[PDB]
TrEMBL record, chain G:
Name of the protein in its database record: Photosystem I P700 chlorophyll a apoprotein A2
Family statement: Belongs to the PsaA/PsaB family.
Positions bound to chlorophyll a 4: R25, H29
UniProt subcellular location: Cellular thylakoid membrane; Endomembrane system
Membrane-crossing segments per the record: 29-50
Domain of life: Bacteria
UniProt-annotated binding residues for chlorophyll a 3: W18, S24
Quaternary state and interactors: The PsaA/B heterodimer binds the P700 chlorophyll special pair and subsequent electron acceptors. PSI consists of a core antenna complex that captures photons, and an electron transfer chain that converts photonic excitation into a charge separation. The cyanobacterial PSI reaction center is composed of one copy each of PsaA,B,C,D,E,F,I,J,K,L,M and X, and forms trimeric complexes.
Described function: PsaA and PsaB bind P700, the primary electron donor of photosystem I (PSI), as well as the electron acceptors A0, A1 and FX. PSI is a plastocyanin/cytochrome c6-ferredoxin oxidoreductase, converting photonic excitation into a charge separation, which transfers an electron from the donor P700 chlorophyll pair to the spectroscopically characterized acceptors A0, A1, FX, FA and FB in turn. Oxidized P700 is reduced on the lumenal side of the thylakoid membrane by plastocyanin or cytochrome c6. PsaA and psaB bind P700, the primary electron donor of photosystem I (PSI), as well as the electron acceptors A0, A1 and FX.
């Protein structure tokens, strides 16, 4: 019994981007030290976080996006 | 109550008194030793019988010697 | 907020936990036959013995050598009477040795002064005898008079 | 120089002695087995 | 050849039991570690952890440690008598004559072989006349193993345990009314050596009497 | 926050201290005046806290000793792979794994021990091993003995590398104290980098090596025409002809099209009908899933870059009304004391090894593991014994923490302080539950002995008699048997055939059956709970009463390892925290012996056995656990007397070494009681009598002979007791199961 | 019951200004108590009650699988 995994439509990428933005919002609301980081150009565009905080938010968005993409593929959304 | 008896082969090193956990022993002046003191056991009714004083005695056979006798509520060391 | 406090005196070896002495265990232990304020002995013992004789006709009536036999409830009654008599002899000799004032704890700051004497513990033992016999006979009568009473079918199907 | 003192200790020498004795007995019972008595 | 080795086992048992007994009888008045052993009498626990450690130095240690050796020697000789006479009475004397020269023949052809009708005194399929002997067999095992508790575990563990039990009694409601007249303490050191010795002994005689009687009564009965 | 800082060349590498024993302790360095010096040399050789007072030097010694221990373990593993490569029938076993026994040790013919070379099949004579190395190598995809020889060579190289690292981290570049205090980086690199990357690498191996080789093995291909695992990678056509989703590349992994990987990443659940082991697709999928989970968990803690936790504010925030202050002080406890860390890690590793034992019997991970009953019984028994030993060592090191590393200044009103404050309420209720469990677990057996002896089979606690059915465990078994398709909708079968289903059988023998639980299982599980609880009682009583008691209040100054305080207070014998470990070793022996007896009887009576062609299962003993495991006489007669008929009749056969070891363990158990029952003052006086006879013939030794100390007498007695009992049970189990299995 | 016990504890006892906050109470009572609850009952109706009236069992197992309309949320 395959879980109907939905091989790569554009809604998968849109959901991944949306959950990355959700991780941005959650980390901007809930993190304790987001300003730690060596350097990155354009700190105003990146919300004033350093590079490891950027990697943490993008990784958490990838976990959330993978979870919701597989879940909504198994349900039949997207 | 136990009997803590101190014999005359005592060098007055005070190790038995410092080893005693219930203040049974003390030092009295004594003319028969180089250190000028010998152990005495006045409040030997508080002796539990642990023989820590007999452990710390540096004589070939111990100048302080504990004889376990009648058992009281202090010899048993009972909090109840 | 420390819900686990001492009883007011920290160097006494006890703690006032919720189970020990909070609000609902100070009452209902001070309101049991032991530790109740107004009762005399031969009334504390009567209540305690009645409860004990009633509860002890549960592992003798349906759990015995005769439990598959119609003599089983009667044998359970006789065994409960014998155990109550042995316990009364134990209470009587415990009093006859000589009793001290009972231990005061955080749950029971006031213990019965009437149980601190040998005469009070003799009244307690006599009340325990009468209560145990009455409770055992009452449980026997209740279990025996409908002759099936399917509440006894429960916990005998378990104890098959 | 400090290694020969360690090899001269009691456990190392008792192990060497026991291995030598066991090896001598084992090499004897291989070449000359089953000697319950002297013939 | 199976009688030579058991006789030397018997000689070992008598010589060793004599060694504990002579050793404690002649060192009863005193010796190098404890010169004044006569002042404390025959039966005292120890003389403290000082002077290196002084457990079992009273002349009562001779009796206490020689009950074990006496029971072991009597076990050896009664196993000898029982197995030799079982070979004689059954009419097959060759079993003892070839299997008593090594200890697995003792362990198999005497213990395991003759415990068969013993342990089947009561089974799920019924009850024999040797059910009381199987029950005594298990009872002797239980008492003998309960002796190990007094002989291996020692006093202050149990005193520390009874202190918690005393706290639990005095702090619970409705049972702190019942107060002890004498303060519950652990069994003393000599007392517990004696209690474990008595358990070892009573279990020893009970389980061997059960095995002996059932082993030679399930066959010749 | 987390950086690498070391000291260069702190300890020179010289042999001058090799010839000076006792250099690590000041008291041991004065010279051996008595023989107690010799035993103190070994008793305090690894106690690094008593040697130096500086925690940095202690941590350096521990870090460098771990490498030497890893080198020893790698020498052992390389020796096992070398024995598989050179002195084994593994190539013969791979051809016919249903009629050839695994053997990896030949015995040299110098005396009559050539009989110990059992006839196991394929023209090979040797000892039938039960370690399960052969099934492990079959699950690893190893097809020939050269791959075992290469792994043995690699194990020797890795052992030499670990020895060089141990020399390097103590004599060339030794880390500082703050290199150990940052446990954040350590735990991140142990979760993601050791468990996560290790299970990811094993998942990749099981994808690329174990799965194709094992599918060709189960398909009926002989192992010497099976291709080597490197042309499966070099030529992906041969890798994609079976499990054809390797035709598409890695892009479905990266586009999250994981479902097309469902042919080789399954969640089948049950056992392989061909081999009796778990599906290797399930194991590869499992390792990939736990690799992702462990790598995710290894990004939790703050090391150098702001993101993460500090494991202190987690502890600081966890506080309630019943506790108050909470976990404050516990981070300093676990970052300044090595003994508290050892007590936690050893307890979790012991319970983990017990979990490993309880899991590998019910869900056998290896091909033809459940078929060979000897391997399964041996790995269960071995992992129970190792796990219980580690749990008792955890109790030991908690006791060592309490008197040597516990500081009351850092611990005011936290959890540890309050545990010390109500230790009487803890220990008394544990004592009550031990007494209750003893009565209502063992008095059931005593009652059953009595009623079976008195001719009252209807008054017993049996299935025919008064029933004691374990309704909660049966309900949980019913939940697990119906779990596939209802609460686990994407599982082909249940996790194990234990909870229900059908008899999984391979060859003619049963791999696994359902294990029905009745009155006997209820009663023996309550004995398990009872014995575990008493072991908990002794160990926890040693932990809580380690520093002080109502008997001896100044007990922390006496130390962890002291015999007694004296004959006073009635006699304060075995009061130390060490002596509670000494008693807990006896009680773990009792507990785990009952556990492995329950296993060896329940599986032999109700799981293991042959399959008749009609379909019914004829078990080894015949299902006598239902009626005989309720009585002590049934355990003595139908288990100990009946199943030791193989170990005592093994003489003159290939299993006679097991009868020899059976008698040897009986000897060592009886030998233990000389040390356990007697005391030091007997033996000191006996040695005094021997010293005069030596003095008479000028045979006075310079090192004066002393009797063993009281703690050492107890240690020798308990080590001999455990050794003699465990060797006895090992011999009995292995000779029974190598004859009936 | 646990909420009522909790709001008698002095940590969670609301202040007098919270009780007399009429503007927030009205907003959360019209939007949440009256609007969100009616929206949730609409969700139950279109998800459970209307398909069970049409013979389609839903339950808690199939409401993520049975789509209430053939054109669902498009
Ligand atoms: C709101 C979006 C969304 C939806 C509807 C789903 C839906 C589902 N998830 Mg899920 N998941 C999500 C977000 C979501 N998830 C997120 C945010 C995470 C954390 C990264 C996960 C991580 C995840 C795990 C760990 C598991 C599921 C699984 C499940 C399935 C069964 C859940 C169950 O047992 O009941 C189901 C398809 C399970 C499955 O079978 O896949 C399972 O193993 N999900
Ligand atoms: C071994 C345990 C045991 C057994 C088998 C029983 C069995 C019995 N008890 Mg008993 N009982 C027990 C322990 C036991 N009791 C204990 C521990 C207490 C104290 C909580 C009670 C308190 C108690 C009361 C208050 C009553 C019973 C009653 C009963 C009877 C019917 C049970 C019922 O209503 O089930 C459904 C039965 C003879 C009843 C009885 O005796 O009436 C004749 C009844 O009124 N028992
Ligand atoms: C302590 C009692 C003892 C006794 C009296 C013996 C005596 C014997 N054993 Mg032994 N045995 C014992 C205990 C003992 N054993 C135990 C503890 C084990 C179990 C591990 C065994 C297991 C065992 C086996 C398996 C074998 C023997 C054999 C031998 C025999 C000759 C051994 C040999 O190499 O001689 C020859 C040795 C010499 C001639 C010595 C030469 C070298 C010396 C040291 C130097 C001399 C310089 C001048 C001999 C009858 C062997 C035999 O032949 O069986 C009958 C045999 O195969 N034994
Ligand atoms: C991904 C990074 C990484 C990896 C592979 C490990 C792996 C290991 N460390 Mg290590 N460690 C790391 C980084 C790493 N560490 C960090 C950053 C810290 C510093 C804060 C520590 C500090 C630390 C201490 C102080 C201890 C360990 C120990 C261990 C060993 C555990 C024993 C075992 O089961 O070995 C089985 C696994 C293997 C043999 C695989 C080896 C993989 C190689 C090295 C690559 C193992 C070799 C312990 C040990 O045994 O010391 C040797 C120990 O004492 N480590
Ligand atoms: C740490 C483990 C690890 C490692 C090093 C490998 C190694 C590799 N994988 Mg991979 N693989 C792994 C985990 C691993 N994999 C797991 C967990 C999955 C499941 C998601 C797969 C699924 C997989 C597929 C589907 C394929 C690879 C393939 C490849 C190869 C890359 C292309 C090439 O060299 O040709 C290489 C051998 C490709 C290949 O060439 O296979 C032979 C291929 O098509 N892998
Ligand atoms: C029922 C028990 C319980 C309760 C009441 C709390 C309460 C607390 N946890 Mg939690 N937590 C618990 C068990 C619990 N936890 C368990 C079992 C784990 C380990 C797996 C964690 C792991 C954990 C971490 C990692 C953190 C908290 C923290 C928190 C705090 C904020 C609540 C939050 O976001 O996490 C609620 C989480 C759960 C209910 C789970 C709060 C004091 C945070 C903290 O330190 O706050 C100061 C934080 O950093 N928790
Ligand atoms: C068969 C051997 C044996 C037996 C009987 C015991 C008995 C006991 N051990 Mg153990 N123990 C043993 C050997 C034994 N041990 C040895 C070898 C050592 C290892 C060194 C110790 C050391 C030890 C320690 C370290 C501890 C114990 C504890 C306990 C108690 C557990 C509580 C319990 O089960 O109560 C129930 C009693 C039983 C199950 C025994 C059988 C009794 C039956 C069921 C009842 C029959 C009574 C009968 C009807 C009375 C009427 C007869 C009348 C004529 C008097 C119990 C008294 C623990 C303890 O006391 O704390 C709770 C503990 O701390 N043991
Ligand atoms: C959106 C968030 C939210 C929601 C859902 C609630 C919910 C509620 N608040 Mg609350 N409140 C909130 C936030 C919220 N409040 C805020 C932020 C403030 C702070 C200013 C307050 C301050 C506050 C106060 C001070 C009080 C409440 C109270 C209550 C309860 C009202 C009584 C009740 O249960 O009637 C529920 C009634 C309905 C859902 C139906 C209302 C009547 C309908 C519209 C008529 C038609 C019915 C319809 C035909 C359906 C029929 C049913 C069916 C059988 C056919 C209710 C649980 C009281 C309380 O403590 O209760 C525990 C109270 O004392 N709240
Ligand atoms: C607050 C009430 C509420 C809630 C909680 C839900 C919940 C949901 N609705 Mg919705 N529904 C509601 C109101 C509600 N509905 C109303 C007001 C309407 C009428 C316009 C609908 C009409 C509707 C349709 C047509 C569908 C959903 C679907 C969904 C699901 C989308 C999430 C998912 O994983 O897929 C989810 C179960 C979808 C669904 O069931 O797919 C699984 C779907 O296609 N809903
Ligand atoms: C799972 C274990 C059940 C634990 C009982 C929970 C109850 C429990 O967790 O209480 C909850 C309470 C937690 O208190 P706080 O809210 O202060 O906790 C804050 C925590 O975060 C710790 O700081 O713990 C205590 O007060 C300990 C009392 C245990 C005293 C009861 C004895 C429990 C042992 C006997 C029961 C054994 C049942 C075992 C079944 C396997």
């Amino acid at each position: 019994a395959v879980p109907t995994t939905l091989e790569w439509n554009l809604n998968v990428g849109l959901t991944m981007i949306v959950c990355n933005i959700v991780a941005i919002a959650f980390a901007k609301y809930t993190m304790k030290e987001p300003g730690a980081g060596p350097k990155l150009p354009g700190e105003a565009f990146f919300g004033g976080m350093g590079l490891p905080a950027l990697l943490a938010t993008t990784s958490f968005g990838h976990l959330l996006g993978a979870g919701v993409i597989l879940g909504l593929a198994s349900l039949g959304a997207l | 109550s136990h009997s803590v008896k101190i014999y005359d082969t005592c060098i007055g090193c005070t190790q038995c008194v410092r080893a005693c956990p219930l203040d049974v022993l003390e030092m009295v002046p004594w003319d028969g030793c180089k250190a000028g003191q010998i152990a005495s056991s006045p409040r030997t009714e508080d002796c539990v019988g642990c023989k820590r004083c007999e452990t710390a005695c540096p004589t070939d056979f111990l100048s302080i010697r504990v004889y376990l006798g009648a058992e009281t509520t202090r010899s048993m060391g009972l909090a109840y | 907020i420390d819900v686990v406090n001492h009883g007011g005196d920290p160097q006494v070896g006890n703690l006032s936990t919720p189970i020990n002495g909070s609000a609902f265990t100070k009452a209902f232990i001070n309101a049991l036959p032991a530790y109740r304020k107004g009762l005399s002995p031969n009334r504390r013992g009567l209540e305690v013995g009645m409860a004990h004789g009633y509860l002890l006709y549960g592992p003798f009536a349906v759990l015995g050598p005769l439990r598959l036999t119609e003599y089983g409830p009667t044998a359970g009654l006789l065994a409960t009477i014998g155990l109550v008599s042995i316990l009364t002899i134990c209470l009587s000799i415990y009093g006859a040795v000589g009793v001290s004032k009972p231990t005061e704890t955080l749950t029971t700051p006031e213990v019965p002064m009437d149980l601190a004497t040998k005469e009070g513990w003799s009244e307690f033992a006599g009340g325990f005898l009468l209560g145990g016999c009455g409770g055992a006979f009452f449980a026997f009568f209740l279990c025996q008079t409908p002759h099936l009473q399917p509440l006894i079918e429960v916990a005998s199907n378990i104890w098959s | 120089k400090g290694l020969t003192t360690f090899l001269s200790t009691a456990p190392v020498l008792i192990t060497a002695l026991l291995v030598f004795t066991a090896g001598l007995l084992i090499e004897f019972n291989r070449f000359y087995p089953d000697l319950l008595f002297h013939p | 050849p199976g009688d030579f080795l058991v006789h030397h086992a018997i000689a070992l048992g008598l010589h060793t039991t004599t060694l504990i007994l002579v050793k404690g009888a002649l060192d009863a008045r005193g010796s190098k570690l404890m010169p004044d052993k006569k002042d404390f009498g025959f039966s005292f626990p120890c003389d403290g952890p000082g002077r290196g450690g002084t457990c079992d130095i009273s002349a009562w240690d001779a009796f206490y440690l020689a009950m074990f050796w006496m029971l072991n020697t009597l076990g050896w000789l009664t196993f000898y008598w029982h197995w030799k006479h079982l070979g004689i009475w059954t009419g097959n004397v060759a079993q003892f004559n070839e299997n008593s020269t090594y200890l697995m023949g003792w362990f198999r052809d005497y213990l395991w072989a003759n415990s068969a009708q013993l342990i089947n005194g009561y089974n799920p399929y019924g009850v024999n006349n040797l059910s009381v002997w199987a029950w005594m067999f298990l009872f002797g095992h239980l008492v003998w193993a309960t002796g190990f508790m007094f002989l291996i575990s020692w006093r202050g563990y149990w005193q520390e345990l009874i202190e918690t039990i005393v706290w639990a009694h005095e702090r619970t409601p409705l049972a702190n009314l019942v107060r002890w007249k004498d303060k519950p303490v652990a069994l003393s050191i000599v007392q517990a050596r004696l209690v474990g010795l008595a358990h070892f002994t009573v279990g020893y005689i009970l389980t061997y009497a059960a095995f002996l009687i059932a082993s030679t009564a399930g066959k010749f009965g | 926050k987390a950086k690498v800082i070391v000291d260069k060349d702190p300890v020179p590498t010289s042999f001058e201290k090799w010839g000076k024993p006792g250099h690590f302790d000041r008291t041991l360095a004065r010279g051996p005046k008595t023989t107690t010096w010799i035993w103190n040399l070994h008793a305090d050789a690894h106690d690094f806290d008593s040697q130096t007072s500086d925690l940095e030097d202690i941590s350096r010694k521990i870090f460098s000793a771990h490498f030497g221990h890893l080198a020893v373990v790698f020498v052992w593993l390389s020796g096992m792979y070398f024995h598989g490569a050179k002195f084994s029938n593994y190539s013969a076993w791979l051809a016919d794994p249903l009629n050839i026994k695994p053997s990896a040790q030949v015995v040299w013919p110098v005396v009559g021990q050539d009989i110990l070379n059992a006839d196991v099949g394929g023209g090979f004579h040797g000892i039938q091993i039960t370690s399960g190395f052969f099934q492990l190598w079959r699950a690893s995809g190893i097809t020939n003995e050269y791959q075992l020889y290469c792994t043995a060579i690699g194990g020797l190289v890795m052992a030499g590398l670990m020895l060089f690292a141990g020399w390097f981290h103590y004599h060339k570049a030794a880390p500082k104290l703050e290199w150990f205090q940052n446990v954040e980086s350590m735990m991140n690199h142990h979760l993601a980098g050791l468990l996560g990357l290790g299970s990811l690498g094993w998942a990749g191996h099981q994808i690329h090596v174990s799965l194709p080789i094992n599918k060709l093995l189960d398909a009926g291909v002989a192992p010497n025409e099976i291709p080597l695992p490197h042309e499966f990678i070099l030529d992906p056509a041969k890798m994609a002809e079976l499990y054809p989703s390797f035709a598409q590349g890695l892009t479905p992994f990266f586009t999250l099209n994981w479902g097309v990987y469902s042919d080789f990443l399954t969640f089948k659940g049950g056992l392989n009908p061909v081999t009796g082991g778990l599906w290797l697709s399930d194991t590869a999928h499992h390792h990939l899933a736990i690799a992702v989970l462990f790598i995710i968990a290894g990004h939790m803690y703050r090391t150098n870059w702001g993101i993460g936790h500090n494991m202190k504010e987690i502890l600081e925030g966890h506080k309630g009304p019943f506790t108050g202050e909470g976990h404050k002080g516990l981070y300093e406890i676990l970052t300044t004391s090595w003994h508290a860390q050892l007590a936690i890690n050893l307890a979790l590793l012991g319970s983990l090894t017990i979990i490993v034992a309880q899991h590998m019997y019910a869900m056998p991970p290896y091909p033809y593991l459940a078929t060979d009953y000897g391997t399964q019984l041996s790995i269960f028994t071995h992992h129970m014994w190792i796990g219980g030993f580690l749990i008792v060592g955890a109790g030991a090191h908690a006791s060592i923490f309490m008197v040597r590393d516990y500081d009351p200044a850092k611990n005011v009103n936290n959890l540890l302080d309050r545990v010390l404050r109500h230790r009487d309420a803890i220990i008394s209720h544990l004592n009550w539950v031990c007494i209750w469990l003893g009565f209502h677990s063992f008095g059931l057996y005593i009652h059953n002995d009595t009623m079976r002896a008195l001719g009252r089979p209807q008054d017993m606690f049996s299935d025919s008699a008064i029933q004691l059915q374990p309704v909660f465990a049966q309900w949980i078994q019913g939940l697990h048997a119906a779990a596939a398709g209802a609460t686990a909708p994407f599982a082909s079968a249940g996790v194990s055939p234990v909870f229900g289903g059908e008899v999984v059988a391979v060859g003619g023998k049963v791999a696994m059956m359902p294990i029905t639980l009745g009155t006997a299982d209820f009663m023996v599980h309550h004995i398990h709970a009872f014995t575990i609880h008493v072991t908990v009682l002794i160990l926890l009583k040693g932990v809580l009463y380690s520093r002080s008691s109502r008997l001896i209040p100044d007990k922390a100054e006496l130390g962890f390892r002291f015999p007694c305080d004296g004959p006073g207070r009635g006699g304060t014998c075995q009061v130390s925290g060490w002596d509670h470990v000494f008693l807990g070793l006896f009680w773990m022996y009792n507990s785990l012996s009952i556990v492995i007896f329950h296993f060896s009887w329940k599986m032999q009576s109700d799981v293991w056995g042959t399959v008749l062609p009609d379909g019914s299962v004829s078990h080894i003993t015949g299902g006598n656990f239902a009626q005989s495991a309720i009585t002590i006489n049934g355990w003595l007669r139908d288990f100990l007397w009946a199943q030791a008929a193989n170990v005592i009749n093994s003489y003159g056969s290939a299993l006679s070494a097991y009868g020899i070891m059976f008698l040897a363990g009986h000897f060592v158990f009886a030998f233990s009681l000389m040390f356990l029952f007697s005391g030091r003052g007997y033996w000191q006086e006996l040695i005094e009598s021997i010293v005069w006879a030596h003095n008479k013939l000028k045979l006075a030794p310079a090192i004066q002979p002393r009797a063993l100390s009281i703690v050492q007498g107890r240690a020798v007695g308990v080590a001999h007791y455990l050794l003699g009992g465990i060797v006895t049970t090992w011999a009995f189990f292995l000779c029974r199961i190598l004859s009936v299995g | 019951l646990f909420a009522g016990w909790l709001h008698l504890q002095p940590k969670f006892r609301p202040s007098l200004s919270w009780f007399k906050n009429a503007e927030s109470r009205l907003n959360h009572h019209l939007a949440g108590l009256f609007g969100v609850s009616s929206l949730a009952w609409t969700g139950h109706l279109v998800h459970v009650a209307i398909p069970e009236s049409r013979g389609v069992h839903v339950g808690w197992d199939n409401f993520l699988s049975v789509k209430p309309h053939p054109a669902g949320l498009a």
